[PDB]
RNA sequence: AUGAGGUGGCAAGAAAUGGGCUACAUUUUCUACCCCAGAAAAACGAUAGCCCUUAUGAAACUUAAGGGUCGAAGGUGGAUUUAGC
């Protein structure tokens with residue numbers, strides 16, 4: 001196999017080859033966001049070989065040819081269910097992290113808009129709501145991912161947490177992040193502050209921010225959360241959602257924004273719906289317009305053959321008839337070269 | 350008048366019994382979806398009780414639907430017994 005960890009080597013000629021994430025990179029760059037099925041696959045194989053695909057290569061080429069002076073260009077990976085949008089976004093995230101960018105990764109925007117029973121009224125803004133658990137978990141993950149720049153960045157304004165507690169201007173962003181992580185009740189606010197800070201620092205040229213949000217359509221969709229009066233809650237009424245909406249605006253420069261659509265886990269969306277407009281909604285498409293959509297599709301014959309060979313070399317296909325050409329054709333037909341269906345099918349052979 | 354007509358009224362539970370529904374959950378519950386999800390998990394569980402509204406009606410206390418409230422018995426059940434090629 002092409003067991004390669006260098007992100008500056010793989011290119012169009014490496015389409016179909018493999019790209020290895022080292023265990024240190026797996027632990028640091030990806031404390032979250034990796035699909036659970038691939039998390040299990042990594043934990044079993046003891047490897048993190050991502051197949052290099054054309055959409056990921058195109059996104060990498062665009063990010064290499066971009067200029068940070070320009071306002072943040074929005075890229076949107078989209079495709080059919082289980083085509084590899086999340087893992088393409090993860091590949092781009094890892095490449096950018098190795099490029100010493102600052103990775104602002106959202107593992108799943110759907111989690112913040114569904115199944116939350118610890119919602120509280122926001123002290124900073126009585127018209128909004130706070131999700132302490134989600135914010136605390138994301139703050140921990142963000143501190144893990146971007147530790148090296150966490151202390152270097154200086155905050156630009158003084159922020160207050162209580163009548164007694166406040167964060168002074170010029171303090172490290174690590175102070176705010178650790179305040180959010182430890183003091184869970186304020187964590188949501190800290191999240192917004194961090195985002196705000198990052199944005200202006202991106203404008204200041206302090207670093208090269210890469211905003212990575214999976215399931216971006218959840219920002220402008222619908223939330224299943226309810227009020228204390230059993231009333232539905234609009235997405236903008238959540239502080240985290242509003243802050244992420246502000247971050248999605250292209251009114252800042254110093255990097256680029258990369259998002260991945262995901263009907264899986266979305267609310268009030270038909271199963272077969274995958275197109276950008278249908279998943280995003282009119283408001284979502286208007287907010288994201290303009291953007292560059294990148295289509296992620298099923299494996300080609302070369303990619304499917306490479307995946308099958310990778311499974312065989314790891315002895316995952318334990319069935320006796322799997323190495324035969326007939327078994328390969330059966331798997332290709334029953335999966336239609338779809339990466340998720342193929343992996344799920346091979347998980348029990 | 351053992352005929353005819355009008356007004357009003359029963360119909361409850363000590364209790365046993367037959368049949369049915371819902372369940373006693375994790376192959377489950379909630380939500381989206383209508384099958385690649387996220388949560389819940391000592392909660393699961395009433396179509397019961399009480400209150401309110403609505404529908405029908407001349408009339409609802411006695412009907413039905415919905416909502417609020419309550420969250421109980423129950424934790425896969427003896428001999429026996431039903432049905433299905």
Ligand SMILES: Nc1ncnc2c1ncn2[C@@H]1O[C@H](COP(=O)(O)OP(=O)(O)OP(=O)(O)O)[C@@H](O)[C@H]1O
Pocket residue numbers: 035037038041049050051052053080081082083084085086087088260261262263264339340343344
């Ligand atoms: N480049 C790749 N190399 C190896 N496996 C891949 C690749 N892309 C996708 N997969 C497989 O796809 C599955 C996960 O799919 P993924 O989450 O990336 O796609 P998706 O369409 O964005 O998903 P979802 O709609 O659920 O958000 C895993 O089983 C993983 O092995």
Ligand SMILES: Nc1nc2c(ncn2[C@@H]2O[C@H](COP(=O)(O)OP(=O)(O)O)[C@@H](O)[C@H]2O)c(=O)[nH]1
Pocket residue numbers: 124158159160161188189190192193196239243
């Ligand atoms: N607790 C606290 N939170 C802050 C402070 N400053 C900013 N924030 C957070 O950062 C966000 C501020 O966004 P802001 O720039 O005011 O956007 P706007 O509300 O639309 O004007 C809010 O969601 C707060 O949670 C502060 O001084 N204290």
Ligand SMILES: [Mg+2]
Pocket residue numbers: 359
């Ligand atoms: Mg009588």
